[PDB]
Design a protein around this ligand. Structure first.
Ligand SMILES: [K+]
Ligand SMILES: [Zn+2]
Length: 210
């Protein structure tokens, strides 16, 4: 697709509302899905979240486990009376009683030039945080402050790299991945339920280029 079209696409895709719940129990766990118990009430209907993830990642959970959710939906189901289920990818971490707010340093380069990013721009209260949560916070920031996906923007490529301080290769997201041009494919990059120990993330390295 063309630059202008990819921008409009991603701008709309990442404008999608994010779901954040710190304490919920898994009602059902299957090979590659987790379904929460009632989260709350949205538009008069009882709200539930279904998380799709690689079987390898799902192996980490069992029915009854207490978990936290931070994810973006790609579909909704209203076929059941007084009920609504949002479908998402990963975004699941073990329940954490006490919040531990921590800022994650960010290094940003736009078209080769380094740009300062405030100390408190990206943060999380989790000791085990998903790459998805960080990505969502990063893109919201970039869209609001650095013209990411904006109309009239010349950007065409970019990446968010998690520069961890361990022996693992650096995990990253492609900021201009468009898949099949819909939420189902674009958000599918979160299916691995990738997460990090907060003390292992040294900082984030972001590149955006035209
Ligand atoms: K990726
Ligand atoms: Zn780095």
């Amino acid at each position: 697709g063309l630059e202008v079209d990819n921008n409009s696409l991603l701008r709309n895709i990442y404008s999608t509302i994010v779901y954040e719940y710190s304490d919920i129990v898994i009602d059902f766990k299957t090979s590659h899905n987790l379904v929460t118990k009632k989260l709350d009430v949205r538009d008069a209907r009882d709200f539930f979240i279904n998380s799709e993830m690689d079987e390898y990642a799902a192996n980490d959970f069992k029915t009854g486990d207490k978990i936290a959710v931070f994810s973006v939906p790609f579909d909704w189901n209203y076929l059941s009376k007084g009920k609504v289920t949002a479908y998402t990818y990963g975004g699941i971490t073990p329940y954490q009683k006490t919040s531990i707010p921590k800022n994650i340093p960010v290094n940003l380069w736009i078209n080769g030039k380094q740009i300062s990013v405030p100390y408190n721009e990206i943060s999380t209260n989790k000791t085990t945080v998903t790459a998805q949560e960080i990505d969502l916070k990063v893109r919201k920031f970039l869209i609001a402050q650095h013209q990411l996906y904006s109309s009239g923007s010349s950007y065409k490529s970019g990446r968010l790299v998690f520069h961890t301080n361990d022996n693992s290769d650096k995990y990253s997201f492609d900021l201009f991945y468009v898949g099949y041009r819909d939420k189902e494919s674009i958000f599918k990059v979160y299916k691995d339920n990738k997460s990090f120990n907060i003390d292992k993330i040294g900082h984030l390295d972001i590149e955006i280029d035209s």
